[PDB]
Design a protein around this ligand. Sequence first.
Ligand code: FAD
Ligand code: FAD
Lengths: 308, 309
Amino acid sequence: VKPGEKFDVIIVGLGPAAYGAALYSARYMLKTLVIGETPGGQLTEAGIVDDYLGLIEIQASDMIKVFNKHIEKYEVPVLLDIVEKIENREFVVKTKRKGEFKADSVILGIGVKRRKLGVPGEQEFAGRGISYCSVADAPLFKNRVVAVIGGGDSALEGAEILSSYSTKVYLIHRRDTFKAQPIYVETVKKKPNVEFVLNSVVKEIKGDKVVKQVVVENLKTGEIKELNVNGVFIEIGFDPPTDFAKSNGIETDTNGYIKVDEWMRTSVPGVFAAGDCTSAWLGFRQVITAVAQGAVAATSAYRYVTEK
Amino acid sequence: VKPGEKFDVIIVGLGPAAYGAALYSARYMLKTLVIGETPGGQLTEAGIVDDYLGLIEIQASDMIKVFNKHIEKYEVPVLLDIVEKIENRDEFVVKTKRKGEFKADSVILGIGVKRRKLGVPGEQEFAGRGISYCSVADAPLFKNRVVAVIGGGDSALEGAEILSSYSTKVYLIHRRDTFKAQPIYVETVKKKPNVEFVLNSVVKEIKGDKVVKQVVVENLKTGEIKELNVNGVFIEIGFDPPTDFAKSNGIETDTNGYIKVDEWMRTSVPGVFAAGDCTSAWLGFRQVITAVAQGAVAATSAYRYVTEK
Ligand SMILES: Cc1cc2nc3c(=O)[nH]c(=O)nc-3n(C[C@H](O)[C@H](O)[C@H](O)COP(=O)(O)OP(=O)(O)OC[C@H]3O[C@@H](n4cnc5c(N)ncnc54)[C@H](O)[C@@H]3O)c2cc1C
Ligand SMILES: Cc1cc2nc3c(=O)[nH]c(=O)nc-3n(C[C@H](O)[C@H](O)[C@H](O)COP(=O)(O)OP(=O)(O)OC[C@H]3O[C@@H](n4cnc5c(N)ncnc54)[C@H](O)[C@@H]3O)c2cc1C
């Protein structure tokens, strides 16, 4: 593809939502272009995916490869770049390096960016005991001692599921209280194998070939503890693309996510959204639901383009 | 499993939505039981599925096999039977036709819908040999071929619209003087130079040799009988939601007879969730991917409900 080319739909992103939307957009015979920065999106940080029905215990890297093969069967052009602006003048989609493209409709599958922690040992033990998704990996830590870092809904829900599989969960958070919804806190509080480690931070993640310990510091007392753990789940949340939405005149909900209706329509006619950047099923971040929302957004774009 | 046993969640159905809910329910460590009549649900009548991302060109029968394999990896017990009633006591009592009754803290309904039957001569004979019940699924296979779409609602009109982008010509056949589809769909399709409306008409027969070759059509006004050469026939006459089952079990339905759910797949009865084609969510869009995703959402709502309880 070249700058200035016009498409029926431009899909922004290259994660599950974008792949799901591209598959349906191409099969609807919409001239489709996908522009995304990172192939696979959040899946680039995942290990094995075993909750996408029908792809049993698949390495996330292989899931990305087969999702790409599926849309390439339909010859969907994929441009690796960052979309900076979406202007209505038809739409003109401006990219950082590869020019401006035109479209009758746009589907945003831009996801959310993981809030970074960055503690010593985190890079060293990537894929070696550290996980960024408790609901995905909890089944892999049956009868192991684990730590969850975080204090919102993501971390409390993570501690709840890990409490079911694991020996014990140390739930570590830097504040004096959790910010999670009260029922999540109360539910986890009643688990005898979950220990709250409030007012604390992880100073270091240590191990040999795999994670073996976390050094924890209490910010109020200075007390330092070394906990022996086999897994560390970093669950500090994700940042929605509020700035991108605001910059491009797209409404966001009061949580900062792109507001969509049932049919994945944003506040801008002709612009749809799918996946975890949206307000739909907020808080539930899964491959299957992003792929499904992509199918719905493609169907809404199809109806919009054909009726236009 | 044995009668009287209690589960955290009982999933009714064995189609995409129930498999999707069972996979998540098992992964949340919910004590799960699946009771369903037909493994695969509507997939038992599908051909090749090429719109479930990541399972490229999978035969529907192979998709049922791998969906089953996936939940059995989690040792989810599956009972092949019909659920006759869901009694709301404190807890639910799910009554089956042949396996006794079971108790549950929550229930997920993935009971789907039933395809309305046309029943024209040649239809059952040419199943899988030129007849399709899903335009969105099969349209890509009819590029540069001639097809007929039978029906008059939204699915037939949108089916014709999609097929017009692949096929050389599309005959849209319906027995009434007008279509009952949203006017916008009718107006949009009418402009296609390759779509021909064949209103006030019925198909008398679907004919072929090894595969579909013709449809015999009768015009109900003029009485004229004519044969149209076609490579494919897409029957798009709708589905029947389980309104009776919903009413029987005290579950509210939407204005179209589907199980009313909110965003999180909650029905009007606390502790009862629903997923897939039987629900009011994304009405009209009936796909494997969306049923499997709604199953995951219903399982998560059941998980939250049970853990809170
Ligand atoms: C470590 C980890 C493991 C996980 N494991 C599982 C699992 O096993 N099962 C499961 O169901 N879920 C899992 N998840 C959750 C799941 O991966 C996400 O819910 C899902 O990937 C969301 O898909 P998405 O397409 O909406 O967004 P993302 O995956 O966030 O992808 C967004 C895409 O948009 C691109 N993008 C963003 N902004 C721009 C821009 N301006 N221009 C161009 N491109 C842009 C990104 O580069 C990326 O390609 C996991 C998440 C993490 C972090
Ligand atoms: C011919 C055909 C081809 C299709 N092709 C495609 C395609 O290529 N791609 C695509 O994405 N979609 C396709 N679809 C649509 C897709 O199959 C459906 O959207 C999907 O199967 C719906 O799944 P579900 O689980 O909600 O319902 P269903 O598949 O309808 O399953 C409902 C389940 O509930 C069971 N059940 C119902 N009542 C009871 C009861 N009282 N007790 C116990 N069990 C009960 C049924 O036996 C069944 O197991 C096709 C549909 C048809 C009819």
